[PDB]
CSV table of N, CA and C and ligand atoms in Angstrom, one decimal:
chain,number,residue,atom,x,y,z
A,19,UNK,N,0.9,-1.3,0.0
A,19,UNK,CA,0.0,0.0,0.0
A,19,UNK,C,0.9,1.3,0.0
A,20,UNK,N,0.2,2.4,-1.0
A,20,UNK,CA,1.5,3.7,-0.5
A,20,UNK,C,0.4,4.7,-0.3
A,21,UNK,N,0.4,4.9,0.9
A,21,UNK,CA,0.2,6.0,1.8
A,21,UNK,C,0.1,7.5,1.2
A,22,UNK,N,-0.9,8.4,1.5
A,22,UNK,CA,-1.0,9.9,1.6
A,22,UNK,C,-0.3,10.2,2.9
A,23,UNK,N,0.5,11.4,2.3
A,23,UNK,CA,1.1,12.2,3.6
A,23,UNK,C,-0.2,12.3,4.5
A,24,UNK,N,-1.1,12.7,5.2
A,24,UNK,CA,-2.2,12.9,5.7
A,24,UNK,C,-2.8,11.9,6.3
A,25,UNK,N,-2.8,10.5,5.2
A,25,UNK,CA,-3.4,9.5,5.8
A,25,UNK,C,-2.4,8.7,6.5
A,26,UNK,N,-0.9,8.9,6.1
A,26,UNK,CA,-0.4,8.2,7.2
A,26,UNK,C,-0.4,8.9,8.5
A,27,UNK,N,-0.2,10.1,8.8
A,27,UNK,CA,0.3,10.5,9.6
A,27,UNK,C,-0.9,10.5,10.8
A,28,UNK,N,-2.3,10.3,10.3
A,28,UNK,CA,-3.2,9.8,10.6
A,28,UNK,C,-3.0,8.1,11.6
A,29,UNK,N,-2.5,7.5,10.6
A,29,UNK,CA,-2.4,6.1,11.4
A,29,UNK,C,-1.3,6.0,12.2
A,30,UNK,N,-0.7,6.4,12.2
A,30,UNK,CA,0.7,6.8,12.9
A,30,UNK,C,0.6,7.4,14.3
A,31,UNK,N,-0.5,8.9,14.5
A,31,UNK,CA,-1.3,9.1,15.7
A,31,UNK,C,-2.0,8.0,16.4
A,32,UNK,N,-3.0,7.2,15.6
A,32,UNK,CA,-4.0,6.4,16.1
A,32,UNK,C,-3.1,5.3,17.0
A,33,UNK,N,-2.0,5.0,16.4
A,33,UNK,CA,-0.7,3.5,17.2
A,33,UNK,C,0.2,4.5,18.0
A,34,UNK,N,-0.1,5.8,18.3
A,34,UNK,CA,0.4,6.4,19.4
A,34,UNK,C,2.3,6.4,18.9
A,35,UNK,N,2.2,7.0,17.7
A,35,UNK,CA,3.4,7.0,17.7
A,35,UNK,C,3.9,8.6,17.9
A,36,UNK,N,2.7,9.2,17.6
A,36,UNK,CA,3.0,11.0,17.9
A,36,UNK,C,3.4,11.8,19.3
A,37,UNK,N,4.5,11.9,19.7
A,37,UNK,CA,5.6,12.2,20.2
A,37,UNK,C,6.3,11.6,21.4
A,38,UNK,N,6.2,10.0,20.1
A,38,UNK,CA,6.6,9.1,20.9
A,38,UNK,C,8.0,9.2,21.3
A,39,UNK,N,8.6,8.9,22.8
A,39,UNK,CA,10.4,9.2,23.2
A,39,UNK,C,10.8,10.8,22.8
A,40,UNK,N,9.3,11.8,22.7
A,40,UNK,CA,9.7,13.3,22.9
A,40,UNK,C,9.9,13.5,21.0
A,41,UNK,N,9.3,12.7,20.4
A,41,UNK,CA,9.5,13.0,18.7
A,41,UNK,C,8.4,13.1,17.9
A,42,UNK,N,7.7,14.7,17.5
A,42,UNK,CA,6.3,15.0,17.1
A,42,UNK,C,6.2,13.9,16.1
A,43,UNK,N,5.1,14.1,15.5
A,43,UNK,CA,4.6,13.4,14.6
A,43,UNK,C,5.2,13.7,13.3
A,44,UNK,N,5.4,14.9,12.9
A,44,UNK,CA,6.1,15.3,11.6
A,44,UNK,C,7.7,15.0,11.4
A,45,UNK,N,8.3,14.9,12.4
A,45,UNK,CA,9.5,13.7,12.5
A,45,UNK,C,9.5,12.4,11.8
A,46,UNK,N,8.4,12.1,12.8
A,46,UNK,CA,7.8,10.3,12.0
A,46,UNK,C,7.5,10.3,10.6
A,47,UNK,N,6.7,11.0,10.1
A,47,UNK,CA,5.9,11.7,8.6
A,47,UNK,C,7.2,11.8,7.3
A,48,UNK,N,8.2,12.6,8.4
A,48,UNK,CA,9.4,12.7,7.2
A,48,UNK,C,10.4,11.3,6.9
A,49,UNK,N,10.9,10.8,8.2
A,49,UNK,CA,11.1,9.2,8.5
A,49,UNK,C,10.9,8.4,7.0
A,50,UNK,N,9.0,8.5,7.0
A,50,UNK,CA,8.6,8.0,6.6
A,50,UNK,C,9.1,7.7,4.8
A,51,UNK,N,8.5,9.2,4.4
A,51,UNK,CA,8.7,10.1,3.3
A,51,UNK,C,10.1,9.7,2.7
A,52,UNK,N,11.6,9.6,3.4
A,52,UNK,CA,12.7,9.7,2.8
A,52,UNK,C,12.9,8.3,2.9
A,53,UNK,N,12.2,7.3,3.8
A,53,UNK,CA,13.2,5.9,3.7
A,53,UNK,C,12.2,5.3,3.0
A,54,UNK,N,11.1,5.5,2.3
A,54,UNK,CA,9.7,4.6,1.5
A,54,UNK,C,8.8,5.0,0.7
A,55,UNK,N,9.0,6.2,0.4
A,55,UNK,CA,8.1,7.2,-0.2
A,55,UNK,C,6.6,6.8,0.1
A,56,UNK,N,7.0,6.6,1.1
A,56,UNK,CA,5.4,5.8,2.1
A,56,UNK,C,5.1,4.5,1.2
A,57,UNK,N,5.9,3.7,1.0
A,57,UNK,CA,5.2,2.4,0.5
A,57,UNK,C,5.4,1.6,1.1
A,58,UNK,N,4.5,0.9,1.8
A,58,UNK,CA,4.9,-0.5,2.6
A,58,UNK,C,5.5,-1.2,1.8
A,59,UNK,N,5.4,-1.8,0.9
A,59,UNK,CA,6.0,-3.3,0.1
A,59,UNK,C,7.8,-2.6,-0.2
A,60,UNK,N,8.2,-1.7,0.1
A,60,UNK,CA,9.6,-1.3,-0.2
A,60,UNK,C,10.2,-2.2,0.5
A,61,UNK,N,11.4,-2.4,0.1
A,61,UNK,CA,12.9,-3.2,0.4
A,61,UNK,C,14.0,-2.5,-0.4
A,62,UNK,N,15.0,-3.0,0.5
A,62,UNK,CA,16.5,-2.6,-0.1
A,62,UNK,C,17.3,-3.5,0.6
A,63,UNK,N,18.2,-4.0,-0.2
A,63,UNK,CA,19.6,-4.8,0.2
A,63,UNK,C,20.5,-4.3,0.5
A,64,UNK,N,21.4,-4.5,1.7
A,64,UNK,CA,22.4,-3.4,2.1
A,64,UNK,C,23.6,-4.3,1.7
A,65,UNK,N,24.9,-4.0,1.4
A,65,UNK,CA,26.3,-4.5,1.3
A,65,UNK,C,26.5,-5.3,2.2
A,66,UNK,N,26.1,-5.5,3.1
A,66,UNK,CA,26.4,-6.5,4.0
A,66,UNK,C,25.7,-7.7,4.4
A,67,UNK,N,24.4,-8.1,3.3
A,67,UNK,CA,23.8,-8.8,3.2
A,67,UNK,C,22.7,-8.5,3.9
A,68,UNK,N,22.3,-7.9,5.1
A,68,UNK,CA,20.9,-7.4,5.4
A,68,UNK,C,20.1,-7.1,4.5
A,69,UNK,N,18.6,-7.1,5.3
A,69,UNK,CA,18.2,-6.1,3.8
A,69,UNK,C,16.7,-5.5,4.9
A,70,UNK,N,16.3,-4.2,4.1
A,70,UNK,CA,15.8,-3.3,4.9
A,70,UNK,C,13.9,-3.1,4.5
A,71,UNK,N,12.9,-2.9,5.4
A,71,UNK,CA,11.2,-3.3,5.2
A,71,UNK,C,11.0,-2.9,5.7
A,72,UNK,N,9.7,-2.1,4.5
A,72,UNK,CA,8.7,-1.7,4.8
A,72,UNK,C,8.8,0.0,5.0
A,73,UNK,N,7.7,0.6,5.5
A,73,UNK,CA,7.5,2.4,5.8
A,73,UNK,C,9.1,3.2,6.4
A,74,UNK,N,9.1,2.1,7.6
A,74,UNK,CA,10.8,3.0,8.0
A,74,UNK,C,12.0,2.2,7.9
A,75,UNK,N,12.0,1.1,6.8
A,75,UNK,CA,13.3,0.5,6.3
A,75,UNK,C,14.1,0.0,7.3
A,76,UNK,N,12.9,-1.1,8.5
A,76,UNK,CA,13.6,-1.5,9.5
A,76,UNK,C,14.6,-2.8,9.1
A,77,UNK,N,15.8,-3.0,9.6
A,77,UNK,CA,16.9,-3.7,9.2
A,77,UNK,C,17.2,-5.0,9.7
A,78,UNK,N,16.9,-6.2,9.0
A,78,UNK,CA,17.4,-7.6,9.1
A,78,UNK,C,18.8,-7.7,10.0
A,79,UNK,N,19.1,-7.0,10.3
A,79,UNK,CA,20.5,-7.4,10.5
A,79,UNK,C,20.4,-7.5,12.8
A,80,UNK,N,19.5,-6.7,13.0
A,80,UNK,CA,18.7,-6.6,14.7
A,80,UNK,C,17.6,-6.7,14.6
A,81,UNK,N,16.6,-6.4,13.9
A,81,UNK,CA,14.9,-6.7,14.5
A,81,UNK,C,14.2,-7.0,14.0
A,82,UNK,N,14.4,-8.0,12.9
A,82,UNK,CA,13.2,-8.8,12.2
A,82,UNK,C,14.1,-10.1,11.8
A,83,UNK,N,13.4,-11.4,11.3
A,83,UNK,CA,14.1,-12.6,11.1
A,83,UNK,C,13.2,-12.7,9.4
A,84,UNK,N,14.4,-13.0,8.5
A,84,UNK,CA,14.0,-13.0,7.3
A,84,UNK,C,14.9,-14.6,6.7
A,85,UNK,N,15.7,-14.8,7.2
A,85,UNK,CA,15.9,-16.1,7.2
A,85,UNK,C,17.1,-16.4,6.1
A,86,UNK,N,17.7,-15.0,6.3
A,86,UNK,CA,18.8,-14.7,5.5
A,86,UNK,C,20.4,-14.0,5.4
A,87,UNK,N,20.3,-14.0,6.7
A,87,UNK,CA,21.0,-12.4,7.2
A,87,UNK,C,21.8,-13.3,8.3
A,88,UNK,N,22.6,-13.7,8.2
A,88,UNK,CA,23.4,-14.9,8.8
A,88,UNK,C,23.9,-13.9,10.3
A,89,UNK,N,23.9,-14.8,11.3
A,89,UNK,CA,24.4,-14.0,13.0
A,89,UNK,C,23.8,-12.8,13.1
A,90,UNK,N,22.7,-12.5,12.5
A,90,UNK,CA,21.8,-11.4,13.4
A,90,UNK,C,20.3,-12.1,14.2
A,91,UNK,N,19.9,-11.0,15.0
A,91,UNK,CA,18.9,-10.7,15.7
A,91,UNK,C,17.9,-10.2,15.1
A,92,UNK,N,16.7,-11.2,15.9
A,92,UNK,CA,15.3,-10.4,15.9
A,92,UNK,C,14.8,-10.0,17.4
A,93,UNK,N,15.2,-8.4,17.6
A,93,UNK,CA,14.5,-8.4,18.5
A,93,UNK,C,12.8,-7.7,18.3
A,94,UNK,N,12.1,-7.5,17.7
A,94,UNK,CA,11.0,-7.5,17.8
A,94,UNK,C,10.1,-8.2,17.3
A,95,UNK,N,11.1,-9.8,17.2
A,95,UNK,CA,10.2,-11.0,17.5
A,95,UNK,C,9.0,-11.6,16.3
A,96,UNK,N,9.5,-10.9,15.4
A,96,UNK,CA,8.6,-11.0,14.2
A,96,UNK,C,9.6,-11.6,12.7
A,97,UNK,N,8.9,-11.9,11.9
A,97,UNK,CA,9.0,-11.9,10.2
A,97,UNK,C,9.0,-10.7,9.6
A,98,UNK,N,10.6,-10.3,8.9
A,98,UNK,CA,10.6,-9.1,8.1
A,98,UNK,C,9.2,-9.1,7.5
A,99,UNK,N,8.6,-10.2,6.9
A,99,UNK,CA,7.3,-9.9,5.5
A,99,UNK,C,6.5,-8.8,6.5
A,100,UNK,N,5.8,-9.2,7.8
A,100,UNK,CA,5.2,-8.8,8.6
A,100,UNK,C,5.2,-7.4,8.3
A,101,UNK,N,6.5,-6.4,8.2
A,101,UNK,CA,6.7,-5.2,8.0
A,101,UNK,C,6.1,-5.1,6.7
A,102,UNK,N,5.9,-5.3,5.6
A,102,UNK,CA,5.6,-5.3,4.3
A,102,UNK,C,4.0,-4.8,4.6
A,103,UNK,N,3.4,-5.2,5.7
A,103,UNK,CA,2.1,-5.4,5.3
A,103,UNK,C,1.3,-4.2,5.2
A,104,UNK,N,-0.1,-3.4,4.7
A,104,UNK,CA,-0.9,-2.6,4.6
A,104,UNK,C,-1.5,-1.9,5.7
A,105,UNK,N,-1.1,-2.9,6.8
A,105,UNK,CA,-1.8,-2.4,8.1
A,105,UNK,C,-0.3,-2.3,8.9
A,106,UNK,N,-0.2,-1.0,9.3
A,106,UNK,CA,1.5,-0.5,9.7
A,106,UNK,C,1.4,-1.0,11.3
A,107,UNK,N,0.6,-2.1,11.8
A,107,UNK,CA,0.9,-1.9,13.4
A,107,UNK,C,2.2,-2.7,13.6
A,108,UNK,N,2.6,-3.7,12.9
A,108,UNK,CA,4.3,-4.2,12.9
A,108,UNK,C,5.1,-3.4,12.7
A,109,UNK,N,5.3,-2.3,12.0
A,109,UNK,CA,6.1,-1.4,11.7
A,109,UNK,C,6.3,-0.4,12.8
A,110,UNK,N,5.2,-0.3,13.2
A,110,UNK,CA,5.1,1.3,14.4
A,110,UNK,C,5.9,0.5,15.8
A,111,UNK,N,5.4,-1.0,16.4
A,111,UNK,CA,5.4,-1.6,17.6
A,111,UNK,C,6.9,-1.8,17.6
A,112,UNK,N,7.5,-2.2,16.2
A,112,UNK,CA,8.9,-2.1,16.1
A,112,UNK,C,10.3,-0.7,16.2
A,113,UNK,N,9.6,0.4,15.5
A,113,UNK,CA,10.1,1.3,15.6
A,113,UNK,C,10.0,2.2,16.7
A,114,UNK,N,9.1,1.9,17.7
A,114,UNK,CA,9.3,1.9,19.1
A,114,UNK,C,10.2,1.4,20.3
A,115,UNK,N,10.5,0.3,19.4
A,115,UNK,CA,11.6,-0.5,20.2
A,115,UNK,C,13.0,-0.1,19.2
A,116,UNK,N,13.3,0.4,18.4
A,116,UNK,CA,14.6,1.0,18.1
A,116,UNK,C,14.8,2.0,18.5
A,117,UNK,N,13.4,3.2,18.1
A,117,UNK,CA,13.9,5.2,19.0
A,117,UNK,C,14.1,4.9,20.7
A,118,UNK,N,13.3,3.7,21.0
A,118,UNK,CA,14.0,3.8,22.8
A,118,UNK,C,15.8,2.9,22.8
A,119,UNK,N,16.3,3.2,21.5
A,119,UNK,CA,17.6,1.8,21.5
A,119,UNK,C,19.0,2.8,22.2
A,120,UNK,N,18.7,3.9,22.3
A,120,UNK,CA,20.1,5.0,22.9
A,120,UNK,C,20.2,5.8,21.8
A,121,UNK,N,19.5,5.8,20.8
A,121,UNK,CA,20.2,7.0,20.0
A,121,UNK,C,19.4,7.5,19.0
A,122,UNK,N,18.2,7.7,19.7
A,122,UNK,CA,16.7,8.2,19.0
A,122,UNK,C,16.2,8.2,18.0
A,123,UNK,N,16.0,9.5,16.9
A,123,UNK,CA,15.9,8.6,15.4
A,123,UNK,C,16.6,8.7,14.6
A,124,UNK,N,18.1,8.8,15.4
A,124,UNK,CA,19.7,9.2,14.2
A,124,UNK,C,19.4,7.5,13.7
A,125,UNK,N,19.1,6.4,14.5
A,125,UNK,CA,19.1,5.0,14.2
A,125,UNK,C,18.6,4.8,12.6
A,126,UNK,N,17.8,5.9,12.3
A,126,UNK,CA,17.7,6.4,10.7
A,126,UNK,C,18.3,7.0,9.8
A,127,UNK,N,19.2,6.6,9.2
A,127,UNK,CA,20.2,7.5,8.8
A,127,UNK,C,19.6,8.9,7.8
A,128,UNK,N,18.4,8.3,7.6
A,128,UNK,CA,18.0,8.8,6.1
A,128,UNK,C,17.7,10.6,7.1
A,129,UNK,N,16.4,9.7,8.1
A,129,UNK,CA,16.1,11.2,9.2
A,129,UNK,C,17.1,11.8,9.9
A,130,UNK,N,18.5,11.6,10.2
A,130,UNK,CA,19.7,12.6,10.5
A,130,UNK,C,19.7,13.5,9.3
A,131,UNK,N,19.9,12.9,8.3
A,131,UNK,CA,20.4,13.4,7.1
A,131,UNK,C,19.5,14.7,6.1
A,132,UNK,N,18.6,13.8,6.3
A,132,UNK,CA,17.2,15.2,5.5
A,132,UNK,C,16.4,15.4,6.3
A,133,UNK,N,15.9,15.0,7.7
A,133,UNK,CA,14.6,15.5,8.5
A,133,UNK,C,15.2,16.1,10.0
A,134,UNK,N,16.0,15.5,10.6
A,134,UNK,CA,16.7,16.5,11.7
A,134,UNK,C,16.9,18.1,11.9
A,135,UNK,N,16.1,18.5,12.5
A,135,UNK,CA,16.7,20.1,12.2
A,135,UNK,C,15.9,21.1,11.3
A,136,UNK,N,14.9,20.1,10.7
A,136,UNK,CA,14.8,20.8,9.6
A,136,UNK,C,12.9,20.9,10.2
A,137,UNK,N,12.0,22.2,9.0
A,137,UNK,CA,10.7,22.4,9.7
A,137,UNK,C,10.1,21.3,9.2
A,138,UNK,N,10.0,20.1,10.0
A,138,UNK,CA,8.9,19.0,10.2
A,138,UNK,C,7.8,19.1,10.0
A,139,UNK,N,7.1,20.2,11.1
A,139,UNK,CA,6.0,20.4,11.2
A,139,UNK,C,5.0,20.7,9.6
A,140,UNK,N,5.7,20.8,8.7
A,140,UNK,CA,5.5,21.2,7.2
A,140,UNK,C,4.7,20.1,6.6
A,141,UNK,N,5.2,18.5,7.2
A,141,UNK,CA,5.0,17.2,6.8
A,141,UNK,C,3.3,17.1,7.2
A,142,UNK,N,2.9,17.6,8.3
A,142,UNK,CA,1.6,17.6,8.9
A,142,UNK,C,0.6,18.8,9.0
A,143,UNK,N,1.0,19.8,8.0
A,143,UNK,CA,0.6,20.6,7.5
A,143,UNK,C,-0.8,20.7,7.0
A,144,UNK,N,-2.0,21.2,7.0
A,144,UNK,CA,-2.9,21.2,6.4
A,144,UNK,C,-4.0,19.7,7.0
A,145,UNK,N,-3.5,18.9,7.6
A,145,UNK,CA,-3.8,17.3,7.9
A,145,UNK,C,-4.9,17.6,9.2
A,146,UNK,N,-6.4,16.8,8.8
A,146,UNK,CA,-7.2,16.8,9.9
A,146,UNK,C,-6.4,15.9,11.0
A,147,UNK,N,-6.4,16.2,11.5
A,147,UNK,CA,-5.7,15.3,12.7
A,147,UNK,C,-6.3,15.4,14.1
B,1,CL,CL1,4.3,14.0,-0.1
B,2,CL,CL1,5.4,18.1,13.8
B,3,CL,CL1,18.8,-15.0,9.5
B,4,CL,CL1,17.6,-14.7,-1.2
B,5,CL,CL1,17.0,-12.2,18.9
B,6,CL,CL1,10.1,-15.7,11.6
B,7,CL,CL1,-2.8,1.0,9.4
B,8,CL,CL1,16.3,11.5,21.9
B,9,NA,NA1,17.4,-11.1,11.7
Protein backbone atom coordinates (compact mmCIF):
# COMPACT_ATOMS: atom_id res chain seq x y z
CA UNK A 1 0.00 0.00 0.00
CA UNK A 2 1.51 3.71 -0.54
CA UNK A 3 0.17 5.98 1.85
CA UNK A 4 -1.05 9.87 1.63
CA UNK A 5 1.07 12.24 3.56
CA UNK A 6 -2.22 12.90 5.70
CA UNK A 7 -3.42 9.47 5.80
CA UNK A 8 -0.38 8.18 7.15
CA UNK A 9 0.33 10.55 9.59
CA UNK A 10 -3.17 9.78 10.57
CA UNK A 11 -2.39 6.12 11.39
CA UNK A 12 0.65 6.82 12.93
CA UNK A 13 -1.25 9.12 15.65
CA UNK A 14 -3.96 6.39 16.07
CA UNK A 15 -0.69 3.53 17.19
CA UNK A 16 0.39 6.37 19.45
CA UNK A 17 3.36 7.01 17.75
CA UNK A 18 2.97 11.04 17.92
CA UNK A 19 5.56 12.17 20.19
CA UNK A 20 6.58 9.10 20.95
CA UNK A 21 10.45 9.18 23.19
CA UNK A 22 9.67 13.29 22.94
CA UNK A 23 9.55 12.96 18.74
CA UNK A 24 6.31 14.97 17.09
CA UNK A 25 4.65 13.38 14.61
CA UNK A 26 6.07 15.31 11.62
CA UNK A 27 9.47 13.68 12.53
CA UNK A 28 7.78 10.28 11.96
CA UNK A 29 5.87 11.69 8.61
CA UNK A 30 9.36 12.71 7.23
CA UNK A 31 11.14 9.18 8.54
CA UNK A 32 8.64 8.03 6.62
CA UNK A 33 8.74 10.10 3.33
CA UNK A 34 12.65 9.70 2.83
CA UNK A 35 13.20 5.89 3.72
CA UNK A 36 9.74 4.60 1.48
CA UNK A 37 8.15 7.19 -0.19
CA UNK A 38 5.41 5.84 2.09
CA UNK A 39 5.19 2.40 0.45
CA UNK A 40 4.95 -0.50 2.58
CA UNK A 41 5.96 -3.26 0.14
CA UNK A 42 9.56 -1.32 -0.19
CA UNK A 43 12.92 -3.24 0.38
CA UNK A 44 16.46 -2.58 -0.12
CA UNK A 45 19.64 -4.83 0.24
CA UNK A 46 22.38 -3.42 2.15
CA UNK A 47 26.25 -4.54 1.33
CA UNK A 48 26.37 -6.53 4.00
CA UNK A 49 23.81 -8.75 3.23
CA UNK A 50 20.92 -7.38 5.43
CA UNK A 51 18.16 -6.08 3.79
CA UNK A 52 15.76 -3.34 4.86
CA UNK A 53 11.25 -3.26 5.22
CA UNK A 54 8.65 -1.66 4.83
CA UNK A 55 7.50 2.41 5.76
CA UNK A 56 10.75 2.97 8.03
CA UNK A 57 13.26 0.53 6.31
CA UNK A 58 13.57 -1.54 9.45
CA UNK A 59 16.94 -3.71 9.25
CA UNK A 60 17.35 -7.57 9.14
CA UNK A 61 20.51 -7.43 10.50
CA UNK A 62 18.69 -6.64 14.69
CA UNK A 63 14.90 -6.75 14.47
CA UNK A 64 13.22 -8.83 12.15
CA UNK A 65 14.08 -12.55 11.05
CA UNK A 66 14.03 -12.99 7.35
CA UNK A 67 15.88 -16.08 7.16
CA UNK A 68 18.82 -14.66 5.47
CA UNK A 69 21.03 -12.43 7.17
CA UNK A 70 23.40 -14.86 8.80
CA UNK A 71 24.38 -14.01 12.98
CA UNK A 72 21.81 -11.38 13.38
CA UNK A 73 18.89 -10.70 15.71
CA UNK A 74 15.29 -10.35 15.86
CA UNK A 75 14.48 -8.38 18.51
CA UNK A 76 11.04 -7.47 17.76
CA UNK A 77 10.17 -11.01 17.51
CA UNK A 78 8.57 -11.03 14.20
CA UNK A 79 9.04 -11.87 10.24
CA UNK A 80 10.56 -9.10 8.13
CA UNK A 81 7.30 -9.95 5.49
CA UNK A 82 5.20 -8.84 8.56
CA UNK A 83 6.69 -5.16 7.98
CA UNK A 84 5.56 -5.26 4.32
CA UNK A 85 2.08 -5.42 5.31
CA UNK A 86 -0.88 -2.63 4.57
CA UNK A 87 -1.75 -2.40 8.12
CA UNK A 88 1.50 -0.51 9.69
CA UNK A 89 0.86 -1.95 13.37
CA UNK A 90 4.30 -4.23 12.91
CA UNK A 91 6.06 -1.42 11.66
CA UNK A 92 5.07 1.30 14.45
CA UNK A 93 5.43 -1.59 17.57
CA UNK A 94 8.94 -2.12 16.14
CA UNK A 95 10.11 1.28 15.62
CA UNK A 96 9.31 1.91 19.05
CA UNK A 97 11.55 -0.49 20.24
CA UNK A 98 14.61 1.03 18.09
CA UNK A 99 13.87 5.21 19.00
CA UNK A 100 13.97 3.76 22.79
CA UNK A 101 17.65 1.84 21.50
CA UNK A 102 20.08 4.97 22.90
CA UNK A 103 20.24 7.00 20.05
CA UNK A 104 16.73 8.19 19.04
CA UNK A 105 15.91 8.64 15.36
CA UNK A 106 19.69 9.15 14.16
CA UNK A 107 19.07 5.05 14.18
CA UNK A 108 17.74 6.42 10.71
CA UNK A 109 20.22 7.53 8.80
CA UNK A 110 18.04 8.82 6.08
CA UNK A 111 16.09 11.19 9.22
CA UNK A 112 19.71 12.60 10.50
CA UNK A 113 20.35 13.36 7.06
CA UNK A 114 17.24 15.24 5.55
CA UNK A 115 14.56 15.50 8.55
CA UNK A 116 16.72 16.54 11.71
CA UNK A 117 16.65 20.09 12.24
CA UNK A 118 14.79 20.79 9.61
CA UNK A 119 10.69 22.43 9.68
CA UNK A 120 8.86 18.96 10.17
CA UNK A 121 5.95 20.40 11.18
CA UNK A 122 5.55 21.16 7.24
CA UNK A 123 5.05 17.22 6.82
CA UNK A 124 1.62 17.56 8.89
CA UNK A 125 0.61 20.62 7.49
CA UNK A 126 -2.95 21.20 6.36
CA UNK A 127 -3.84 17.35 7.92
CA UNK A 128 -7.19 16.76 9.90
CA UNK A 129 -5.68 15.35 12.65
CL1 LIG B 1 4.30 13.95 -0.12
CL1 LIG C 1 5.43 18.07 13.78
CL1 LIG D 1 18.76 -15.02 9.47
CL1 LIG E 1 17.55 -14.73 -1.19
CL1 LIG F 1 16.98 -12.18 18.90
CL1 LIG G 1 10.06 -15.68 11.61
CL1 LIG H 1 -2.80 0.96 9.44
CL1 LIG I 1 16.28 11.48 21.92
NA1 LIG J 1 17.42 -11.05 11.72
Amino acid sequence: KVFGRCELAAAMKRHGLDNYRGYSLGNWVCAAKFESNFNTQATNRNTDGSTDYGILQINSRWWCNDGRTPGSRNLCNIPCSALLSSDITASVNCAKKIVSDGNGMNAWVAWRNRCKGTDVQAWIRGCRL
